[PDB]
Design a protein around this ligand. Structure first.
Ligand SMILES: *[C@@H]1O[C@H](CO)[C@@H](O[C@@H]2O[C@H](CO)[C@@H](O)[C@H](O)[C@H]2NC(C)=O)[C@H](O)[C@H]1NC(C)=O
Ligand SMILES: *[C@@H]1O[C@H](CO)[C@@H](O[C@@H]2O[C@H](CO)[C@@H](O)[C@H](O)[C@H]2NC(C)=O)[C@H](O)[C@H]1NC(C)=O
Ligand SMILES: *[C@@H]1O[C@H](CO)[C@@H](O)[C@H](O)[C@H]1NC(C)=O
Lengths: 596, 247
């Protein structure tokens, strides 16, 4: 009666009831998200604590098992999920104080209140309106005022709150034998099993920027081009030596340059690739869109969709008193239950979103054969990257023409190719610097070697080197501008978005090579190539049973992260940028400011 | 019944029609290992044994010769040389409950693998470690019996399937169950060959006026040559004459 068999029997007892309870809870959650009503609300409680009232006890009894000698790596890894102290290591007062501070910070961040002084009785929130008006306009006064007001009424009273949150999170990190909460986050990309596949938390810190510097010549070029368009859009507001302010990026944070794409259009003569008029003319309902997505998925190589999903899952227009939130989600309710939740309509964007959600469902089924504690991806980014692969391949013009979205006699050329490529890069490679700098700043703030004074101003100079942003209004210590973001107060690791883009680029590039296609990467199509889908499913079926480094070995030949697909994809854009902004000089200056 | 309490039935002394069930589309799985389903109606055994229960959909492949699994080892076991057939069909519409078909249970833990054609219904608490589980479950205690979470939405694999396995025993005692025989029509005044109730021969059949006692089946005149028969259905006496021949 060795302890290994005792642990195996404990897992066998645990997993069945855990699956049953998780299935019940997920079914209730899906019902409430499909039936917005008070009756479905209390049910959450009736399950919620119960889940904990089942999980914590199993976590309570997952300590006397000596999880240090089990030969089966799968068994030890599965048991490691239950052998987690969590936040229970802290005292009750500390835990309740942390919970209260998280609640208040999230509520105050989500309840941003800015009233225009002319009409002080009508404030505006993060919901459309002020953000919508300032994100789509051509002005410097209103945008800057809105940015300052938002950073003032969210930053003033959250600086001590975020400080206390960070220090208590770090304290509980030491409470769980972690010298830093940054290491706690990096533990997702941490494996110490098979030799040659192990990864460490410290290595990832440098590896994140090791693949980041190579896009600096490209991204800056776009910025230079943007700056060129800035000299064609903003008269005497951005110096050619310097760069643009925060509120002129199109968003209050400047994560993406989509809001600035219209200003920086490369060639507006050629219309963009749009076939939504065809689906409206051809009467493409939600059913037709889902059927075509299913057919393309089958052509790729994934197994055909099963029944039950087409009836239980909602597809379009909650409509009447039977209301439902339809934010794009793919629900893996467990026990062989997979459903979609998204308002599908007659749009190519809705087509791509449906492709994304159903690819998420397919990936969920791919590792559904894994046990309850292994039915997840190797890391956070793999799920979203896999979901986005098919959406990327479902928008290629060749794919549209094959299923007859584009005209059968359509003819694309270099002008629309360059326009589309720049449009994609303005968001894809235009967000990597901001994501990397935010992740690094969060790494320092969790590690805490920087003092509390070195929070704002350091940020506001560091953003100069990476994102290329000047200060429209000063910020010394009286706000918390970085802390006033959605993925800063909800305890969300921000490296997932950085990793997802690189993973999806690598997978798309590898599929394009091993899919029998010729030409540029942006026009690559994986339709009717079942070998590529078979290799993709070989990757997907691993789930959590294999390390992420070992997972990154079937579709792609590199277990680590590389930047080569990023440069290869935007090759025509890079060679157009090289001879486009010849008059101006690339790079920005960190000394110039709009006020000086 | 339960998988570990499989319902056992003995069938003997009747005529068994197999093609009637074989020619049915309501059975999801129909696997025969002894002989072909068509040939089954020809030969016959001395008795039949039926094991009936309902299991999970994914476990149907577990019940087979040379197959192992939790059901195949701790709930019900079959030998490698099993003779007979297995018939399974979905019971999601009936057995699975909206509130959960937790009435059904399966044996998850057992000290030893079950023997072929053997049933275990023990409810003794199982022990996985050195600590003796004295009554109430402790650390190394796990219940052998686990319920079922059948729901209307559980995927095809989790739907409960009704499974019945038929085995045939042909002990040296006289056979008691056999398939239907099928009888043709009757002709007269023509040289034909016949197999009346297993008695075969050629000749021409005519109407006669002999008076059998109520228990004879045929008759012979002398030198032991059959001359008359009684048809098993109409129960009338027919006379046999050899077909004409000569030089
Ligand atoms: C998934 O695709 C396969 C391949 O077409 C489907 O299999 C056939 O589908 C057609 C039309 O959908 C039917 O007329 C055939 O009878 C199917 N044959 C078989 C052997 O299944 C399959 O039905 C599709 N899955 C679903 C749920 O529709
Ligand atoms: C075998 O079954 C047949 C079918 O019913 C029987 O034939 C009928 O028997 C009844 C009995 O009164 C008669 O009224 C009918 O006229 C018969 N039908 C015919 C001759 O075509 C037959 O008797 C049965 N054999 C038995 C009982 O030995
Ligand atoms: C949604 O919930 C309300 C409130 O309990 C109930 O009256 C209604 O029947 C529900 N509808 C569905 C489709 O479940």
């Amino acid at each position: 009666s060795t302890i290994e068999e005792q642990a195996k029997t404990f897992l066998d007892k645990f997993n069945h009831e855990a699956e049953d309870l998780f299935y019940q809870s997920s079914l209730a959650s899906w019902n409430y998200n499909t039936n917005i009503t008070e009756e479905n609300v209390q049910n959450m409680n009736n399950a919620g604590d119960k889940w904990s009232a089942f999980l914590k006890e199993q976590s309570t009894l997952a300590q006397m098992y000596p999880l240090q000698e089990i030969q089966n790596l799968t068994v030890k890894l599965q048991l490691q999920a239950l052998q987690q102290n969590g936040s229970s290591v802290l005292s009750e007062d500390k835990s309740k104080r942390l919970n209260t501070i998280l609640n208040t910070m999230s509520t105050i961040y989500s309840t941003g209140k800015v009233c225009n002084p002319d009409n002080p009785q009508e404030c505006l929130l993060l919901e459309p309106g002020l953000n919508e008006i300032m994100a789509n306009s051509l002005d410097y006064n209103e945008r800057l005022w809105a940015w300052e007001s938002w950073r003032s009424e969210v930053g003033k009273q959250l600086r001590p709150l975020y400080e206390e949150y960070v220090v208590l999170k770090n304290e509980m990190a030491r409470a769980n034998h972690y010298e830093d909460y940054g290491d706690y986050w990096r533990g997702d990309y941490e494996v110490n099993g098979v030799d040659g596949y192990d990864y460490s938390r410290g290595q990832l810190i440098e590896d994140v920027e090791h693949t980041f510097e190579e896009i600096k010549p490209l991204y800056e070029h776009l910025h230079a081009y943007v700056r060129a368009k800035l000299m064609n859009a903003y008269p005497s507001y951005i110096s050619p030596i310097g760069c643009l302010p925060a509120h002129l990026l199109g968003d209050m944070w400047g994560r993406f340059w989509t809001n600035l794409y219209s200003l920086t259009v490369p060639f507006g003569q050629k219309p963009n690739i749009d076939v939504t008029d065809a689906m409206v003319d051809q009467a493409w309902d939600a059913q037709r869109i889902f059927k075509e997505a299913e057919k393309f998925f089958v052509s790729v190589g994934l197994p055909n969709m099963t029944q039950g999903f087409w009836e239980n899952s909602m597809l379009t227009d909650p409509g009447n008193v039977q209301k439902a939130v339809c934010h794009p989600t793919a629900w893996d309710l467990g026990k062989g239950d997979f459903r979609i939740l998204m308002c599908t309509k007659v749009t190519m964007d809705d087509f791509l979103t449906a492709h994304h959600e159903m690819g998420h469902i397919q990936y969920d089924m791919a590792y559904a054969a894994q046990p309850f504690l292994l039915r997840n991806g190797a890391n956070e980014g793999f799920h979203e990257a896999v979901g986005e692969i098919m959406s990327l391949s479902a928008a290629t013009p060749k794919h549209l023409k094959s299923i007859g979205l584009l005209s059968p006699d359509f003819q694309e050329d270099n002008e629309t190719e360059i326009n589309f490529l720049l449009k994609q890069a303005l968001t894809i490679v235009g967000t990597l610097p901001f994501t990397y700098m935010l992740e690094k700043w969060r790494w320092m703030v969790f590690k805490g070697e920087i003092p509390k004074d070195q929070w704002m101003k350091k940020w506001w100079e560091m953003k100069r080197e990476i994102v290329g942003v000047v200060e429209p209004v000063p910020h010394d210590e009286t706000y918390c501008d970085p802390a006033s973001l959605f993925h800063v107060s909800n305890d969300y690791s921000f490296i997932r978005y950085y990793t997802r883009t690189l993973y999806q680029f690598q997978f798309q590039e590898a599929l394009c090579q091993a899919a029998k296609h010729e030409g540029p990467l942006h026009k690559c199509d994986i339709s009717n190539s079942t070998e590529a889908g078979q290799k993709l499913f070989n990757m997907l079926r691993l789930g959590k049973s294999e390390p992420w480094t070992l997972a990154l070995e079937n579709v792609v030949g590199a277990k680590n992260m590389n930047v080569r697909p990023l440069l290869n994809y935007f090759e025509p854009l890079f060679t157009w940028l090289k001879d486009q902004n010849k008059n101006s000089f690339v790079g920005w200056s960190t000394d110039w400011s709009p006020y000086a | 019944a339960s998988v570990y309490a499989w319902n056992r039935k003995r069938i003997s002394n009747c005529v068994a029609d197999y093609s009637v069930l074989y020619n049915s589309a309501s059975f999801s799985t129909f696997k025969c290992y002894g002989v072909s389903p068509t040939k089954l109606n020809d030969l016959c055994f001395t008795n039949v044994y039926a094991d009936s229960f309902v299991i999970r959909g994914d476990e149907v492949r577990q019940i087979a010769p040379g197959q192992t699994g939790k059901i195949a080892d701790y709930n019900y076991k079959l030998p490698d040389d099993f003779t007979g057939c297995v018939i399974a069909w979905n019971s999601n519409n009936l057995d699975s409950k909206v509130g959960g078909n937790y009435n059904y249970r399966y044996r998850l833990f057992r000290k030893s693998n079950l023997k072929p054609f053997e049933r275990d219904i023990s409810t003794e608490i199982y022990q996985a470690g050195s600590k003796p589980c004295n009554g109430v479950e402790g650390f190394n205690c796990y219940f052998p019996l686990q319920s079922y979470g059948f729901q209307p939405t559980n995927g095809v694999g989790y739907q409960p399937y009704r499974v019945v396995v038929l085995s045939f025993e042909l002990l040296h005692a006289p056979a008691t169950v056999c398939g239907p025989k099928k009888s043709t029509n009757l002709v007269k005044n023509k040289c034909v060959n016949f197999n009346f109730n297993g008695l075969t021969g050629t000749g021409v059949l005519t109407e006669s006026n002999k008076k059998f006692l109520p228990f004879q089946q045929f008759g012979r005149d002398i030198a032991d040559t059959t001359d008359a028969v009684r048809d098993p259905q109409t129960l009338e006496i027919l006379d046999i004459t050899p077909c004409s021949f000569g030089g």
